[PDB]
Ligand binder design. Sequence first.
Ligand SMILES: Cc1cc2nc3c(=O)[nH]c(=O)nc-3n(C[C@H](O)[C@H](O)[C@H](O)COP(=O)(O)O)c2cc1C
Ligand code: SF4
Ligand code: SF4
Ligand code: SF4
Ligand code: FES
Ligand code: FES
Ligand SMILES: [K+]
Lengths: 432, 263, 45, 214
Amino acid sequence: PKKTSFGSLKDEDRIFTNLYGRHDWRLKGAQSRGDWYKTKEILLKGPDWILGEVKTSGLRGRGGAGFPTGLKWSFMNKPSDGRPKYLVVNADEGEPGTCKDREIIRHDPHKLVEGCLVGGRAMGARAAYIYIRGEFYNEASNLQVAIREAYEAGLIGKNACGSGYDFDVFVVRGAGAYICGEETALIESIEGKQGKPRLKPPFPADVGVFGCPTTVANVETVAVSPTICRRGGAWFASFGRERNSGTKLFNISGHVNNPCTVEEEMSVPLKELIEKHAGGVTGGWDNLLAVIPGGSSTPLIPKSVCETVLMDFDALIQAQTGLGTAAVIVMDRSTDIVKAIARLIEFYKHESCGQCTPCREGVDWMNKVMARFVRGDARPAEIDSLWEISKQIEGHTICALGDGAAWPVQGLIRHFRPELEERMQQFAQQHQ
Amino acid sequence: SNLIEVFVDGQSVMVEPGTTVLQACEKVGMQIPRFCYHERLSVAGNCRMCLVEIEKAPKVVAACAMPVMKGWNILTNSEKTKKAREGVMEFLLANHPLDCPICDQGGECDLQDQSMMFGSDRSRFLEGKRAVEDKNIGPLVKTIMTRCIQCTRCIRFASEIAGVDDLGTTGRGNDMQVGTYIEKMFMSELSGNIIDICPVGALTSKPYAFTARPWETRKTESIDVMDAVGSNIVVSTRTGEVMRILPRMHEDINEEWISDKTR
Amino acid sequence: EPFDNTTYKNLQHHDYSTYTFLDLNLDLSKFRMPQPSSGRESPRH
Amino acid sequence: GALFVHRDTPENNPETPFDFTPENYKRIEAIVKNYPEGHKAAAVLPVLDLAQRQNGWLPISAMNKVAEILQVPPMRVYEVATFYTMYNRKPVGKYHIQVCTTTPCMLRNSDSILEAIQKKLGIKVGETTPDKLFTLIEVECLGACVNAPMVQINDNYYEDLTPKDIEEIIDELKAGKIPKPGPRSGRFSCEPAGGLTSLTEPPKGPGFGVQAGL
Ligand SMILES: Cc1cc2nc3c(=O)[nH]c(=O)nc-3n(C[C@H](O)[C@H](O)[C@H](O)COP(=O)(O)O)c2cc1C
Ligand code: SF4
Ligand code: SF4
Ligand code: SF4
Ligand code: FES
Ligand code: FES
Ligand SMILES: [K+]
């Protein structure tokens, strides 16, 4: 029956077979690895069949929120009200510690392009706008070159793959804002405005880019759809736990011997993932201080939790953190944990779009308090003050960037309050 | 027929579909706090002062932007709602300058009043405050942008009512600044109205500067004769002297706007 | 056929120039489908 | 410096000469056609970038010219130019060094990289060399954390740097040369240094694992 331990994924089950760019990344290389194979038959089965496969696979968003992808793509499976329907692929990839989306674009720019056609067909869209980080200039070019080849081969454009379905794939480059990864702020950027997220309940599936139905999906979420439709949703569901099905890309960075990007089965133990693929922690699994398991947005967890925690949404939620983008950041015992988290709050203070009050003023307020905790120029009573300020940002903002700046502070105060208080005693006795 | 029943504090009210939570609360005499929502401007949803709790939901919703759904119970005075208004007001006043004695808005300032009614009573902000450089936009509107709370009312008014796309937001995060970027004069026949919609003393009247306080003026409700529209005005007098001219709402003539000549 | 798994095969980006991305966008205009219209030249019309 | 209000100067004013080259006007009309008719304002970001690529920075005249061709209010372009960090509203050198300093790079001694560049070029963060060759700034995560520490120069990434690898790169740039982008260590893009731990077997062919129908 079901499994208990997860990991040790065979290469024949991996989806991104050119993750390290050691084969041809152009059309001929992609086709030899299975890309664009029998894509016409996928299209002719209609949106219902494609949406069914994603539902069965239990796939969940890979951008950081983890909503059920198959259920999220069914909002666009409605009749036409006279407006065009678009698909926006989120390639902003701005979360600190996250590098997975860079490799998919630069080394497999035909699973992404094929994903747009299959994902677009499910939603009934006419075209796909791929929003790629503005600093990824070289990656955007390879994406354009692959898109050009797809057009020349008849794989996209008019009568895509001989299916009678017209689909155009456009690439639009950002201009250097982390907030443009947010789905609505991404849409506002495509429309020529500032990267300021919109409010809901006007949802992108009802009023989106150019005021039209749209779906915003991560590159990894879109770059695995064609494989699921071919190998089946049953095959994809065979990995990871229940409700955490699938293979996941991981970025293991920080204080590890061999920082790298690898693909691994969901629910893989955190200790195994670092040891097996990343060469372990610098100084062995005893110099470990804390880990940020899902990019800067997620709270850190200390060594005690890291012993047995599994890398999936449900397991990390129970550990008072999240999976996020599966961007594992490892910090050893030589790290200034207060200073490491202070730089993350400075990052969010430089990336706040500045629209809504709690994160315009609150994040800039958390940054200044953190800048004093690092030096210890604060009282212990300000730790609880910092906690309360954090809870006033979380849930009161337009977008989740405010939430993503509260959680790192809360993680620091949850597990490392003794460190913060000791830092303040040292300053107090020195600066009498 | 098409009305949907919603509850405000448990009291039932029948509203049209598309009515916002803020508008539903108006039908029972409850005014939700606000700094960015104006009934004659487009919805912005960026001051968060209108956050209100919906029973059986964990996240507070923006009252000015959220449409009501059938059966909702809006808790306009719950603990969760009251703690939201205190958190937002705390953020609004963190970098706000201590200009109240020298600020023309004092005594008729929404930030002051809503801070008394919905905010806390003391500060726990121990850092240094932000300070922005002023921006000359003409001889009528005085600009002191350290008092701005980034509500964008002036931006939306200038674009939707006046038809002049000269005010915007330059910057990002805590350094975001409202203004014209270039040295430009916001000269229009409706320009004086940004003084009234600006909830704070960031935009004030230059002819009226320092002359009076709101509480000592007598409000005489009169008519305007500068043109043939007949805008309804309020004439503020102080000890037998006219101090300023304010708009008076008339839905069929001028709403709450007056021309610069009338002002 | 040669399974040369020990070489990087993504060196084409060492030759990209300051106008590479936009030139590719220009080359693709001949393949795009006709764009839809809102019936007006701008929201200000 | 780092100001978001424009003050006219002889070197930057609405009379400063700027106009797209005839080649760029063909690029602009290609960009403008990527968006639905009646939404030409969607092309501000790519057309502002194209203006910067031609010029190297964005004088106030450049911003106005983009507003004219797109029929958008100039203030709306000023909002976009001031919002995004990549747009340069002040002249920079031909080589714009951007050192990441966020935590994943800070953990792997990205401060040492910054010190090396500062000592070599004899400047501080945010300054420009007297010859208008190099400008040094700190940026946020550039999306190459596994290859930390790293810098960006113009459109290229240089990765897995050490205080010696970065100094060599500036030497090649400084004289006449164009260093090749990519990690400066023994690995290629992101693989585990010391040998692949996955994707060692040959990839499967066109139709492996296909289900019945497909
Ligand atoms: C501040 C912020 C930054 C974000 N950046 C990204 C990103 O770079 N790539 C991405 O796929 N999703 C990002 N997201 C999440 C998106 O808003 C959205 O949840 C996701 O892209 C939806 O696509 P998915 O189903 O593949 O997850 C970000 C969210 C926030 C609040
Ligand atoms: S939380 Fe911050 S980034 Fe998000 S909309 Fe509000 S101000 Fe902008
Ligand atoms: S705007 Fe209101 S709160 Fe601010 S200084 Fe003026 S009177 Fe005081
Ligand atoms: S100047 Fe006044 S009206 Fe304009 S954004 Fe600031 S507070 Fe709002
Ligand atoms: S009045 Fe609703 S957010 Fe400002
Ligand atoms: S933290 Fe430097 S590239 Fe991500
Ligand atoms: K005012």
